[PDB]
Amino acid sequence: AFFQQQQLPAAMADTFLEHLCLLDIDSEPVAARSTSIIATIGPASRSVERLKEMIKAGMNIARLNFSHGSHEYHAESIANVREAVESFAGSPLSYRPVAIALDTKGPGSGGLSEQDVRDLRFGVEHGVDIVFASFVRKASDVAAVRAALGPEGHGIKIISKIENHEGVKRFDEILEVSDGIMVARGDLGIEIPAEKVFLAQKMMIGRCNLAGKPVVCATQMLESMITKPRPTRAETSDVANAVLDGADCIMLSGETAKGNFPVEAVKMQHAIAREAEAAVYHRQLFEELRRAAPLSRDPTEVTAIGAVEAAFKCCAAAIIVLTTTGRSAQLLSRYRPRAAVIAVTRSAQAARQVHLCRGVFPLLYREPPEAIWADDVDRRVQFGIESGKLRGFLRVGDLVIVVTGWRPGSGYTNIMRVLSIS
Amino acid sequence: ELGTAFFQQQQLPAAMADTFLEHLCLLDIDSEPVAARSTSIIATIGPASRSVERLKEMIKAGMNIARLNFSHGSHEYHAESIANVREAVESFAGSPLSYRPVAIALDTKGPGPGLSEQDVRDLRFGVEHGVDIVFASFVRKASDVAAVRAALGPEGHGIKIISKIENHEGVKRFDEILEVSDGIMVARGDLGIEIPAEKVFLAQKMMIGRCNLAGKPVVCATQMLESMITKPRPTRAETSDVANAVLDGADCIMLSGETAKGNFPVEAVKMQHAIAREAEAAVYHRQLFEELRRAAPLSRDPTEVTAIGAVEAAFKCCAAAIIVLTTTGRSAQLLSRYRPRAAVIAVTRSAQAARQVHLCRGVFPLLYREPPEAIWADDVDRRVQFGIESGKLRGFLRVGDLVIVVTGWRPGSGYTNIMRVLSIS
Amino acid sequence: RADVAQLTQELGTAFFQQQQLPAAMADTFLEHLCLLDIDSEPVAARSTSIIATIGPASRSVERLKEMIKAGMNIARLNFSHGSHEYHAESIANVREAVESFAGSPLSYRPVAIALDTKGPGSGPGLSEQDVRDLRFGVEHGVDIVFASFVRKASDVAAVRAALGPEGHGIKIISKIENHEGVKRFDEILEVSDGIMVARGDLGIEIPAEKVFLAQKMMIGRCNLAGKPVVCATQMLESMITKPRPTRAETSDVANAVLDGADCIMLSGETAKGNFPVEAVKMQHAIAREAEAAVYHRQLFEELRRAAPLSRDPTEVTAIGAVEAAFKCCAAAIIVLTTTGRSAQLLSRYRPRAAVIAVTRSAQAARQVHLCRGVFPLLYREPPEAIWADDVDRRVQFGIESGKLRGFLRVGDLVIVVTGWRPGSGYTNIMRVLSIS
Amino acid sequence: GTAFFQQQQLPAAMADTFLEHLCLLDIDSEPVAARSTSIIATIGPASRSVERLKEMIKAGMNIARLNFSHGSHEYHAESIANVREAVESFAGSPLSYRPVAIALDTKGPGSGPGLSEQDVRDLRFGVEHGVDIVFASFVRKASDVAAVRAALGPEGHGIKIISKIENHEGVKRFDEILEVSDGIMVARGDLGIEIPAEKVFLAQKMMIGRCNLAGKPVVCATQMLESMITKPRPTRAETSDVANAVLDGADCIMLSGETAKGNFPVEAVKMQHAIAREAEAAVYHRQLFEELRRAAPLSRDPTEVTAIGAVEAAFKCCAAAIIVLTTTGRSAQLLSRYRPRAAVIAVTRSAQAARQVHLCRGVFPLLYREPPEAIWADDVDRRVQFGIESGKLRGFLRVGDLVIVVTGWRPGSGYTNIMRVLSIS
Ligand SMILES: O=S(=O)(c1ccc(CCN2c3cc(O)c(O)cc3-c3cc(O)c(O)cc3S2(=O)=O)cc1)c1ccc(O)c(O)c1
Ligand SMILES: O=S(=O)(c1ccc(CCN2c3cc(O)c(O)cc3-c3cc(O)c(O)cc3S2(=O)=O)cc1)c1ccc(O)c(O)c1
Ligand SMILES: O=S(=O)(c1ccc(CCN2c3cc(O)c(O)cc3-c3cc(O)c(O)cc3S2(=O)=O)cc1)c1ccc(O)c(O)c1
Ligand SMILES: O=S(=O)(c1ccc(CCN2c3cc(O)c(O)cc3-c3cc(O)c(O)cc3S2(=O)=O)cc1)c1ccc(O)c(O)c1
Ligand SMILES: O=S(=O)(c1ccc(CCN2c3cc(O)c(O)cc3-c3cc(O)c(O)cc3S2(=O)=O)cc1)c1ccc(O)c(O)c1
Ligand SMILES: O=S(=O)(c1ccc(CCN2c3cc(O)c(O)cc3-c3cc(O)c(O)cc3S2(=O)=O)cc1)c1ccc(O)c(O)c1
Ligand SMILES: O=P(O)(O)OC[C@H]1O[C@](O)(COP(=O)(O)O)[C@@H](O)[C@@H]1O
Ligand SMILES: O=P(O)(O)OC[C@H]1O[C@](O)(COP(=O)(O)O)[C@@H](O)[C@@H]1O
Ligand SMILES: O=P(O)(O)OC[C@H]1O[C@](O)(COP(=O)(O)O)[C@@H](O)[C@@H]1O
Ligand SMILES: O=P(O)(O)OC[C@H]1O[C@](O)(COP(=O)(O)O)[C@@H](O)[C@@H]1O
Ligand SMILES: O=C([O-])C(=O)[O-]
Ligand SMILES: O=C([O-])C(=O)[O-]
Ligand SMILES: O=C([O-])C(=O)[O-]
Ligand SMILES: O=C([O-])C(=O)[O-]
Ligand SMILES: [K+]
Ligand SMILES: [K+]
């Protein structure tokens, strides 16, 4: 029964053609949904009750579009998101952190516009986790956003939005200095011929997967759901194809901001992403990712590829990793394991930010530190196992891979352990 | 010999990649498509696309197959549409090197347990009006195809039957349906209601894969450019959907309401044309050819043996085209199954085979109207020269190019066995 | 070039030109052949073990000491000829030469003792002489038995039963010497600890031109099973009378290593020849060169693809450790083992990194020579009060011995494989450590 | 039938990995194809008897080597005369005549820097006696090959020059030597002294790989069956060495002392024949063909384009043979570089080309002696029938088999452009 679920017959295929032939509509997805859902917050989804339903449906990141709306409006939206998120903080084994992202208005006619400087300052003051920098054309644009965040905004992730021809041409220099990329298809589809956008999407997803950096596919994914309760055949196909391409996050804009079915749009993306993740051809994908990743003498990098390889060998349910900054979880995520990466952290910001990485399920550990560090590490691993059993990831008898370091502080990951559940 | 500029067009840097990941990374928005569009466009004929002037613009935009939906309209309405399509198509027959054959397909209303009474009448209509293809609605098992084949009566055994998979039973019995059908249509509209909407992409990918494996045409249909019914430009998801159906391996892409009732029927056809050209260049031929080769079984049929030899030779020299002489279309279909980058120019005297080969990706049919020569070898050579003259006129060929020429050793269908390398002079 | 640029900056261009590293980066096997360089020097220690047959030419304690220094790992006693008294004297001489180096771990090289049976000859089952010879082996504490003319699985069960209750730890290597053995190979392999491709008898039981097919099929199936495979007979035959081998002989040795043989053997070359030490040195030299010419990119992928899924943590940790060793060009994988099993599971994935096996079992230290790439270290210190400290002392012993023997350098990365509790069968931890 | 797919290692050929391929190798899977690696036998006291030479030709000798390291010009002229007499004794039955090449192995430069005076005399002797191949000893750089070419003068323009790599400089300057040579000989005897004995296998594997990549013949020589000089059976290392040279990709394998001066010259030739047949079936064509196509660059030469198409078509139908018409041997050489499993039967009128194509693996030369037909197309068809008749007589072909035929569109060398699929009647 196990080998007939989650497209396991199609996963055993020796060719991609044989893999397509073996895809089964009756082979049910078992794994948790890995691709994160970014929902834009607007009038259709601003109430605390609305937001609680959206978190339950699968929203991981809340986007604030600073193109329209006042600072007062956006501060109220942030307060509402935080209130809906913290309403679930009473049960720590099931708490789902939700990141807050600020989408800048952009340079328009102008370098960094004065409104952008004010909006970036607002973001730092309100503790946003991510910034979607609009119309990034070169590496110096990213540096300008980083300087506008100042010394207080060091921890904020900068995701560069590629929306025009120059951004696509200077992609490699932009990616080198950004934390991730957003394929902003709306403006891109106007700046370049509409029929070429899929080429830019596929090239950018490929290069981000190669770099190990998050990539977001955005705009008009379920557009018809703004007025209709069901998406078109092209829309469900578009979402599935962005996941198959290798997108870390999928986004909803007007569908959640102004539409009549914001919760239904989130549920629809959740349903499609789960099916698409099972249809991934891991045999070729893992080989190509493994081959392309450079040789490294960084123990975190070395332990990560050992852990992903071991997870494939035993069909591990999860890889539990201890992380301070999210880096150890991100290095596991780049090799695209089929096993869920349960990241246990004390940093609330790192817990929200790891939603950018496909397959990372953040767990915020709130307990106070133990006297003996080894015991504190062991307690955090047990917390990961308990939350895993509670959320359905783990069952007794399952194998898990545990990734830890030899000393406290970030950057010392070097241990991988094979563990039997209970 | 070819120059540095040549190797920067039609995604040639991405084609040289050693991995699919490297291939994705090398895709360039500035690498212009050079090859002609190989995925055929099926347009549904309706109120928005009925006039002879409108049909002439649609043929110029890229329509290869005209669909008549027998769920709507009447026998009289649909007979007038057929007459209008034929009139617009024949308006270009005066320039024989640039004439474009256009197939006519009848989409049945559907089933009741057996073949409905209306379907029997609509199939009789189809045979009487000389349709080339039938899209059989709601095919659930092989016996459904046999019923359609029997209803095509005495005079219509040459009509192609494309089975529409629109429900769970069709998907489950797919292999038996494909065995007895000429091709498949992934009818996403009904399928998306009969099975969960989020599973349709799995059925589409499985079905395209199995059709590519079988060497039979596969059509992706419904809501491809849906928003273009009222808006002059499609959504980002729509252009992506069309590109992905071509990348998946679809032989044909379809327009329904976009051409039947929409405000932009010509623009919808142009949009599908533009996307398909870009998507065809993005195909990773290195892996695709090897996998098609590896999966295909051994053959002792000289037509199949010559076909794989010709495709292999076309890849070796970056041949502009493979010119094939075909009576029934079979030799062109066997070349098409290996997915060459080179255009398959099929020269035929059969007007029905010329229309029907639009079902096969990369087959450009040419209807030869000249009278036969006394010596067969001369007649064969004249038809090959006609393929070269048409290829030069339409832009496929230039002097100095290499083409592969596929012929047989004797007249009549079924004797293809020769492959020749020719330099265009 | 991008997948090695940073490591090229760190380790230098000289590092990437040694041990056929340009040929290892090749995308095709054809490109790999084209890139093989006679100026690319082997760096890693020799991983294919050398089995030398003991005889009049290699019996003296002084001769045996020179052979151990030249690279002999396993000493074979051919029971086809010679009395029990003769073979007991050879065992005594081998043990005396081996123990002459037991002062320190950087000199000590544990050498296994293997008994090659006479065989069934005319008879159907286990001959009376074989029963007597097998009981002699148990009484003298041999580590391996090369069972001659194994024709079916029941033959290996007869050898196991003849070893009795005390010989339960002895490894049984079945010799395939005829057509029936080749046909029933799968059933024989399933019940044996390993296989020997006994080409001498095989070459007259089947057509001489077919022996290479049997050798390649058998090595392939043993590599697939993760069981040791020995290539034997006439490898350096001309060296019995000549100081240098023929061009076909050096090629044969290299090809057996490239095929995937865990051990290569010398028979008449060491037992009766005029150059026993030179024959051992020649096999050593060829095996190092051949090991570097292996195309690990394809071999590792195929070994993974073919290996079934496992829920045994020892197996899961083993593949994780080998994968991590390839990622950082690790000098070694240090593994703690009681029976040798953890070292064997690392060895089946054919790492380029040396597997340094730290063990307290002298028998396991001798027996791991059957596995390609396993370098046994016998730990002689008495146990610590705290097990975690005892484990850490054994790991440090491995590092110190690796540094002192040339296996490791400061700045190198090593992969350390251990278990969560004492006793055999609990391996589950992989650690990435930087040598300081 | 089932029986067919159990012979010539066909189960091991279907394997998806090289490891699975090794596991599937069967000692009971009998070779069916003819032996494709040529056997070079050195002539001497053991093999000068015209009766002994006839037995060696029957055993499988394709090329006869004269070692100019020793022996007078009188001695070597007698050896040539005896080889020609034994070869021409079979000319009376043209469907079974086996051409045998004569190769001159030079003494070398020794202490000197350039072409020695003795080498000039021996090269002039070779041209005067009509040798087909020269094995130039101790080639250290491209200029050494040019010196041998100049010493052959204008009359020796047709002689093939195979450079022997016997030292470190030759291995280091390999690419420049290969560029100007017709082929390479891995001269392991001297090479094993000039470089450490344990490194010779690396030089052999690198050189065979680069020659296979270039499409140029490579010979593996020295001590292959050394023990057979005095013993009737080889050692286990010897049979393994021969098999491994064929598996590596060697076009020719050589016997030196074993045939020139030993006690079992015919048995040594038979032994090489037996091993080469088994080893050729054990080649993993699935990987080899893919790597050879991937490594070969795009070509606009119709001979090269037709060659890869023909090899691909031969694999598709399990063709018994590829019959090719050749004047210089070039068309057969281009087929041979892709390493087909099908025998390349080369039909030629040039006696020199017939002898020289023995350097290419899988090429079986047929010397066509009949006078030309009035119509060229008929003359071409008679030559194709001659290949079929020789093939049937020699065991390569049976009625019902498929054969690929490679020809050109006009007489003269360099016009190969046609590939045809033919059913044997
Ligand atoms: O999921 S993967 O393993 C993954 C691996 C390989 C490929 C093949 C890419 N081709 C293609 C692209 C499509 O979009 C599509 O639907 C169908 C086909 C196709 C169909 C065939 O029937 C066929 O035989 C070959 C192709 S194709 O090679 O042209 C796709 C995906 C992964 C995905 C993304 C990566 O970055 C990666 O490294 C690997
Ligand atoms: O060590 S022997 O068994 C022994 C020693 C040498 C040889 C030489 C001939 N070969 C061969 C031929 C056979 O028909 C056969 O049956 C076995 C073998 C064989 C076996 C081997 O184990 C081996 O090392 C070499 C060969 S071989 O292929 O060369 C045979 C046999 C012994 C040694 C001393 C003797 O008095 C005696 O009669 C036999
Ligand atoms: O092929 S035979 O004619 C045949 C068999 C045995 C011999 C013995 C000669 N040698 C020898 C003698 C020994 O006392 C010994 O301990 C080892 C070796 C030996 C071992 C080797 O591994 C090796 O390769 C060569 C030799 S050796 O040549 O030096 C001669 C000839 C036949 C075949 C089968 C037999 O079983 C048999 O007894 C004789
Ligand atoms: O055939 S010979 O060239 C000639 C014949 C035999 C030997 C010894 C056997 N070996 C060998 C065999 C050959 O067939 C060959 O070509 C080269 C080599 C070779 C060359 C070396 O220079 C070397 O040092 C060692 C070897 S080898 O030991 O591997 C040397 C030489 C000739 C034979 C007889 C003569 O009278 C004569 O002048 C030359
Ligand atoms: O070292 S390997 O990675 C490894 C070893 C060999 C192969 C062979 C692929 N072939 C091939 C392809 C080429 O382009 C070429 O130029 C030569 C040959 C070749 C050479 C030979 O010497 C030969 O014996 C056979 C062939 S082949 O035709 O089969 C692949 C891979 C390993 C060795 C053993 C294994 O079990 C395994 O999985 C992999
Ligand atoms: O000068 S030597 O090193 C010295 C040693 C050997 C040799 C060649 C002797 N052979 C031989 C003799 C021939 O005329 C001939 O046409 C071919 C071959 C030959 C070829 C081969 O291909 C092969 O592999 C072996 C031989 S062979 O050994 O039978 C020359 C010279 C020396 C060695 C030992 C002595 O005791 C001595 O007096 C001289
Ligand atoms: O992924 P990061 O940010 O490098 O953090 C991983 C770190 O987490 C740990 O496992 C636990 O460290 P702390 O106890 O200080 O949180 C370290 O050993 C390791 O270095
Ligand atoms: O593709 P099909 O229908 O089998 O037809 C291919 C046939 O066309 C030809 O090339 C030309 O034949 P005709 O001259 O009769 O049209 C035949 O030699 C070959 O058999
Ligand atoms: O390879 P084996 O025989 O399973 O032994 C590995 C064992 O060695 C250890 O690392 C150390 O155990 P000991 O204290 O018994 O020596 C165990 O944790 C592990 O189970
Ligand atoms: O292999 P080569 O030397 O190029 O010769 C091939 C030539 O042989 C032919 O098939 C027959 O030519 P001839 O009749 O002149 O011998 C030519 O058409 C072709 O050009
Ligand atoms: O800003 C965006 O997200 C866009 O344009 O798609
Ligand atoms: O009938 C159709 O085309 C459908 O259902 O998609
Ligand atoms: O006993 C052996 O090793 C043989 O016969 O090969
Ligand atoms: O000349 C040769 O052939 C040699 O020296 O090996
Ligand atoms: K319909
Ligand atoms: K010579």
Side-chain angles (χ1 to χ4, degrees), chain B residues 12-328:
Chain B
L12 290 174
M16 309 300 309
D18 298 307
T19 63
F20 184 65
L21 173 56
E22 183 192 359
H23 159 77
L24 292 173
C25 300
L26 294 176
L27 289 172
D28 193 359
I29 61 161
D30 291 337
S31 184
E32 294 309 321
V34 187
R37 193 242 320 149
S38 65
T39 300
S40 290
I41 296 167
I42 300 166
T44 301
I45 307 305
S49 49
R50 216 155 171 271
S51 81
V52 168
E53 293 308 297
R54 186 60 66 82
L55 285 166
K56 283 174 187 182
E57 292 310 301
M58 291 228 308
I59 291 169
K60 273 152 56 178
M63 175 187 59
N64 307 115
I65 304 171
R67 173 188 176 249
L68 307 162
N69 187 7
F70 274 59
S71 287
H72 323 324
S74 61
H75 284 202
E76 311 67 48
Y77 190 84
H78 289 313
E80 196 195 339
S81 276
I82 294 166
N84 289 352
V85 166
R86 289 177 178 164
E87 181 180 332
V89 170
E90 287 349 285
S91 79
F92 304 96
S95 318
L97 297 168
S98 54
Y99 166 79
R100 273 135 183 78
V102 169
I104 292 167
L106 189 146
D107 200 311
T108 70
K109 190 174 211 166
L115 193 60
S116 65
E117 171 180 355
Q118 198 58 58
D119 278 9
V120 163
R121 296 321 196 217
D122 297 344
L123 298 168
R124 183 78 199 135
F125 173 94
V127 173
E128 289 167 348
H129 288 268
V131 308
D132 312 293
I133 307 160
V134 165
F135 294 141
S137 292
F138 268 89
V139 174
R140 299 181 235 77
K141 56 202 109 211
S143 68
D144 286 359
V145 186
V148 172
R149 189 90 62 184
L152 284 168
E155 318 99 325
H157 307 295
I159 294 171
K160 298 291 188 166
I161 300 171
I162 305 299
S163 294
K164 297 167 63 183
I165 307 297
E166 326 205 47
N167 73 345
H168 192 269
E169 192 174 357
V171 178
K172 293 287 104 184
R173 300 177 168 270
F174 186 77
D175 291 342
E176 86 177 54
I177 295 169
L178 180 59
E179 192 181 320
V180 300
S181 308
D182 294 296
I184 291 296
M185 182 191 282
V186 182
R188 303 188 306 171
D190 282 302
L191 191 59
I193 284 306
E194 309 284 325
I195 80 165
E198 66 270 19
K199 285 177 179 293
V200 174
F201 84 95
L202 293 161
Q204 173 178 328
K205 281 154 193 285
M206 175 274 287
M207 291 191 279
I208 296 174
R210 295 194 190 169
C211 289
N212 287 187
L213 178 73
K216 292 196 172 171
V218 62
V219 178
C220 180
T222 309
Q223 295 187 307
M224 309 207 78
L225 299 183
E226 169 94 317
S227 83
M228 288 192 74
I229 288 178
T230 63
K231 308 195 175 53
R233 302 205 318 118
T235 77
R236 300 310 174 276
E238 287 167 351
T239 67
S240 156
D241 180 51
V242 169
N244 278 302
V246 175
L247 292 167
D248 286 336
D251 290 87
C252 308
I253 50 175
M254 196 160 100
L255 293 161
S256 293
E258 304 99 316
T259 50
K261 66 156 167 175
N263 295 329
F264 307 93
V266 185
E267 293 79 2
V269 173
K270 288 183 169 179
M271 185 55 64
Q272 284 208 330
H273 171 76
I275 304 162
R277 264 197 117 209
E278 296 287 350
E280 280 137 29
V283 163
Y284 187 38
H285 292 93
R286 178 177 291 220
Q287 183 167 357
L288 178 66
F289 185 49
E290 195 228 81
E291 295 192 345
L292 287 170
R293 226 162 78 230
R294 219 149 142 137
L298 296 179
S299 181
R300 306 222 312 138
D301 168 39
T303 315
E304 182 98 79
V305 176
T306 310
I308 198 163
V311 171
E312 177 69 81
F315 277 122
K316 183 64 173 192
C317 63
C318 242
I322 299 168
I323 298 164
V324 61
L325 260 58
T326 198
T327 297
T328 69

Side-chain angles (χ1 to χ4, degrees), chain D residues 190-201:
Chain D
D190 282 301
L191 191 59
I193 280 132
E194 309 284 325
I195 80 166
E198 67 270 19
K199 284 179 178 295
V200 174
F201 84 96

Side-chain angles (χ1 to χ4, degrees), chain D residues 17 45 48 96 116 185 277 282 284 344 346 364 378 404 422:
Chain D
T17 64
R48 286 167 115 237
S96 58
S116 74
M185 183 190 286
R277 265 195 117 210
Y284 187 40
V344 174
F364 301 87
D378 291 340
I404 303 299
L422 216 71

Side-chain angles (χ1 to χ4, degrees), chain D residues 65 69 105 137-138 164 166 185-191 221-222 254 256:
Chain D
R65 174 188 175 250
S69 293
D105 201 312
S137 291
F138 268 89
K164 297 167 63 183
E166 326 205 47
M185 183 190 286
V186 182
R188 305 186 307 171
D190 282 301
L191 191 59
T222 308
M254 196 161 101
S256 295

Side-chain angles (χ1 to χ4, degrees), chain C residues 76 78 80 116-117 148-149 175-177 196-204 232-233 265 267, chain D residues 236:
Chain C
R76 173 187 175 250
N78 188 8
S80 280
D116 200 311
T117 70
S148 291
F149 268 90
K175 298 168 63 182
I176 307 297
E177 326 205 46
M196 183 190 287
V197 182
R199 303 187 306 173
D201 284 305
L202 191 60
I204 90 276
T233 310
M265 194 163 102
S267 292
Chain D
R236 305 304 175 277

